[PDB]
C-alpha cells in the first residue's frame, strides 16, 4: 500500500505558557520507527524524540509523544509553551525500504507583552538609501499586521525581540516605500491597530 | 566541540541543464547517510541512504539524481540536466542505524536553478537611526536594517556592536519578502530590527554594523553585462550612537 503522512494542524499560534497538542497520522502501520523534529528558518532538522515500533511513548523534558502503531497515530504534547519553542515541528517514519515526513505543524509561541504601548514611529532617512521607513512596536500579541493596499509599499510581519538583560520583550512590523505619497501616518491602515496607538508627530 | 553533520557547498547557483555534485561528512561514528529534497511545494523528500559504501534504500526521484559513498562514510549525490523545480534545500542526515536511530541533519546545500545569471543580483544594504520620539517616549532606540534587491534568496544578515556579533535585541524576518510577489524570479527583500537602550544609543562611541553576506556567481561563471558581477560578497552598513 501507499504510505501518506498527514500532520494537523498545519499552523499554530498560542500565547507562551499553554500547553499544546500536534498531531501525526500514517496509513501504513507496518513502520519501524516514528520520529519528530523540529526545523527552524535557515537551518536543517533537529531530533526531538524517537520511537520504536515496540514502544507506545517517549519523553524528553516538556515533550511527550505517544505511539498507537495499530491505530496510525501520534501525539506529540509540548507543555508550557516558550517562545524558543516557534519552529515547524516534522513527522516521520520508517517504513521497510522508504522513508516518509509529513507536511509540518509550524508553530508560533507569542510572548506575553505585560505593559503594552503601541506607537509608530518614523525612522531617520539613510544618507545611503532612498527609502522611508516607519516602525509599528510595543504592540500587545493580539495585534495582526496586515499587507499594505498598496503593491509599493512594503510590511513586514510581526517580528519579536528580546532585550535579555532588561527581561524585555516587544514586537514590531516594519513598513517602507520609496514613493513620495507615502506617509508613516497612514502606512499601517490596512491592519486592525490598537485606537491607543501613539503617534508622534514628525 | 565536536563536529556535526557537514555539507559542502552551502550555496549554488546554476543555470537550466548544468549539473551539480554536492557532499556530506557524518557525524564520527556514524555509517547511514541519507539526502533529501526539502522545498515549498513538495516539503522534505527521500533521495536515497548509503551504509558501508552501497545504497540501501531508494525514493521515487528519476534517474538522473544519483549518489554514492566513500569509504570513510563520506557521500556525494549529483544532480544533472538541472530544472528550475530543482530548486530546493538539499539535506543530508547520518545515523548510527536509520532503522532505530534517531536521524541528525546537516544545514543543507542551498540550491536556485535559474533560466539566467543576468536574474542574479546583490542586496543593497542601509541602516536607519532610531526616532527621537522612540528615545523620549521609552527610553530605548531601535535601528533597522533593509536588505533589498537581492536574488537569490542566500542571503545571511546579522549585527555587529563594537565588533562583536549581538543576538539579544535582534529580530530579522524569517523569510524575505517578494518585491514583485507575481514572478518567479522576483528580487528580494528583508528586513531586521537591533534595539538598545537609550543609554547606549546616547554614546557617541558606540558603533553599529548591519552585515548582509550573499552568496553569488563563482569566479568560473561567465559574465558579460555592464554592472559588476555579482559574486559572492558582503553589504555592510553602519551607524554610531549620537548624544543628541
Known amino acids: 500500500m501507499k504510505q501518506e503522512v498527514t500532520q494537523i494542524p498545519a499552523a499554530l499560534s498560542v500565547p507562551e505558557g499553554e500547553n499544546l497538542v500536534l498531531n501525526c497520522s500514517f496509513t501504513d502501520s507496518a513502520i519501524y520507527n516514528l520520529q519528530w523534529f523540529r526545523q527552524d528558518p535557515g537551518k536543517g532538522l533537529t531530533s526531538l524524540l524517537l520511537i520504536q515500533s515496540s514502544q507506545r511513548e517517549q519523553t524528553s523534558g516538556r515533550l511527550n509523544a505517544s505511539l498507537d502503531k495499530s491505530s496510525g497515530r501520534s501525539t506529540l504534547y509540548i507543555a508550557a509553551s516558550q517562545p524558543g519553542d516557534s519552529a515547524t515541528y516534522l513527522c516521520?517514519?520508517?517504513?521497510?525500504?522508504?522513508?516518509?515526513f509529513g507536511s509540518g505543524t509550524k508553530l508560533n509561541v507569542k510572548p506575553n507583552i505585560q505593559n503594552p504601548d503601541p506607537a509608530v514611529y518614523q525612522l531617520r532617512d539613510s544618507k545611503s538609501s532612498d527609502k522611508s521607513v516607519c516602525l509599528f512596536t510595543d504592540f500587545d500579541s493580539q495585534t495582526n499586521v496586515s499587507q499594505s493596499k498598496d503593491s509599493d509599499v512594503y510590511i513586514t510581519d510581526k517580528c519579536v525581540l528580546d532585550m535579555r538583560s532588561m527581561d524585555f520583550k516587544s514586537n514590531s512590523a516594519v513598513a517602507w516605500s520609496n514613493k513620495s505619497d507615502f506617509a508613516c501616518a497612514n502606512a499601517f491602515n490596512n491592519s486592525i491597530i490598537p485606537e491607543d496607538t501613539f503617534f508622534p508627530s514628525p | 566541540m565536536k563536529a556535526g553533520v557537514t555539507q559542502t557547498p552551502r550555496y549554488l547557483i546554476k543555470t537550466r541543464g548544468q549539473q551539480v555534485t554536492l557532499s556530506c561528512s557524518p557525524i564520527?561514528?556514524?555509517?547511514?547517510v541519507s539526502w533529501y529534497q526539502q522545498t515549498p511545494g513538495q516539503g522534505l523528500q527521500f533521495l536515497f541512504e548509503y551504509f558501508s559504501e552501497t545504497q540501501r534504500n531508494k525514493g521515487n526521484f528519476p534517474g538522473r539524481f544519483s549518489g554514492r559513498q566513500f569509504s570513510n562514510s563520506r557521500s556525494e549525490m549529483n544532480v544533472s540536466t538541472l530544472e528550475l523545480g530543482d530548486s530546493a534545500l538539499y539535506l543530508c542526515?547520518?545515523?548510527?542505524?536509520?532503522?532505530?536511530?534517531?536521524?541528525?541533519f546537516g544545514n543543507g546545500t542551498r540550491l536556485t536553478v535559474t533560466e539566467d545569471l543576468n536574474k542574479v543580483f546583490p542586496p543593497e544594504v542601509a541602516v536607519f537611526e532610531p526616532s527621537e520620539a522612540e528615545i523620549s517616549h521609552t527610553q530605548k532606540a531601535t535601528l533597522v536594517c533593509l536588505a533589498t534587491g537581492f536574488f537569490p534568496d542566500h542571503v545571511e544578515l546579522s549585527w555587529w556592536v563594537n565588533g562583536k556579533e549581538v543576538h539579544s535585541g535582534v529580530c530579522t524576518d524569517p523569510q524575505p519578502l517578494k518585491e514583485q510577489p507575481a514572478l518567479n524570479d522576483s528580487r528580494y527583500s528583508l528586513s531586521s530590527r537591533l534595539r538598545v537602550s537609550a543609554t547606549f544609543w546616547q554614546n557617541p562611541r558606540n558603533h553599529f554594523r548591519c552585515q548582509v553576506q550573499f552568496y553569488g556567481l563563482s569566479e568560473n561563471d561567465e559574465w558579460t553585462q555592464d554592472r559588476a558581477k555579482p559574486v559572492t560578497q558582503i553589504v555592510s552598513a553602519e551607524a554610531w550612537g549620537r548624544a543628541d
Open positions: 542526515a547520518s545515523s548510527f542505524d536509520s532503522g532505530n536511530s534517531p536521524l541528525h
Open positions: 564520527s561514528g556514524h555509517r547511514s
Open positions: 516521520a517514519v520508517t517504513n521497510f525500504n522508504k522513508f516518509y
